[PDB]
Design a binder for this molecule. Structure first.
Ligand code: VO4
Length: 297
């Protein structure tokens, strides 16, 4: 029972030692492509790279590299693409990946400006009447509508392949009050946001993997994916005790380094999963309580 593991960890004040245990047990795979000199300007952080075995390949011939990893959780039956905040020169790469991987949703967990600095490019149009065209990858992107809440915003985007003129609708879920190296305000407001992503169809198996990013694509992105997979696994049987959150994290770091970046984020994940167990185990009323507790209006 992760409730007992949680209480035992809290009581001994062992969150930092436990978190360092995961870091030292974590997979270590080569990132040879990411480090090729020609890819220097494609990485936002020197110390954050996708493993070669799980990196997302662009379907282009010039250079197929992007800082993005496929997290394939076989037992949970869910896939995610975790990526960094697009750079001014990789916004076309980012949308090409979205197109080629057939994703329906993009979860953005950071602000463009955080802590006084630019953590991500403005890679989607802020105004309906000012579409964006990415000429390197021949893609058109239009803001179709926005639904602005108090701590997150949902956008409907139209992505057009300017070569084939096929169009796709993309849902953008922008969490705007989750600080870098930090935790959400509350389990309830994190879960409320997670379930709004789930309710959108963006995580259906009829779609390509949802794209999840923050600035580096590891810390907040890791927290979001870990909690989601844990709740899905618990959903599959109806057996909370079946879910080893630390083993799930380690399995995830087989596909991308550094997932979950502080010990308080690991502790938050437990709380989110424990609270989320109420809904998975039969209490649907808890969804509306999260929404109310979130003050999203
Ligand atoms: O932009 V993150 O530091 O939460 O990987």
């Amino acid at each position: 029972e992760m409730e007992k593991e949680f209480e035992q960890i809290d009581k001994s004040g062992s969150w930092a030692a436990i978190y360092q245990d995961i870091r030292h047990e974590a997979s270590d795979f080569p990132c040879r492509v990411a480090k090729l000199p020609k890819n220097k300007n494609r990485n936002r952080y020197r110390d954050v790279s996708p493993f070669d075995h799980s990196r997302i390949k662009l379907h282009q011939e010039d250079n197929d590299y992007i800082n993005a990893s496929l997290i394939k959780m076989e037992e949970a039956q869910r896939s995610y693409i975790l990526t960094q905040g697009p750079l001014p020169n990789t916004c076309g790469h980012f949308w090409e990946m979205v197109w080629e991987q057939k994703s329906r949703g993009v979860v953005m967990l950071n602000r463009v400006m955080e802590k006084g600095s630019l953590k991500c490019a403005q890679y989607w149009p802020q105004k309906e009447e000012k579409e964006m065209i990415f000429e390197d990858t021949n893609l058109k992107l239009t803001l179709i509508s926005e639904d602005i809440k108090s701590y997150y915003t949902v956008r409907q985007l139209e992505l057009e392949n300017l070569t084939t003129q096929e169009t796709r609708e993309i849902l953008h879920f922008h969490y705007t009050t989750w600080p870098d190296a930090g935790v959400p305000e509350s389990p309830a407001s994190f879960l409320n946001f997670l379930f709004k992503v789930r309710e959108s169809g963006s995580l259906s198996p009829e779609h390509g993997p949802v794209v999840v990013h923050c600035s580096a694509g590891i810390g907040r992105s890791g927290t979001f994916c870990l909690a989601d997979t844990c709740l899905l696994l618990m959903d599959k049987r109806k057996d909370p005790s079946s879910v080893d959150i630390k083993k799930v994290l380690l399995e995830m770091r087989k596909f991308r380094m550094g997932l979950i970046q502080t010990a308080d984020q690991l502790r938050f994940s437990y709380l989110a999963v424990i609270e989320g167990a109420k809904f998975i185990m039969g209490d649907s009323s808890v969804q509306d309580q999260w929404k109310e507790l979130s003050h999203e209006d």
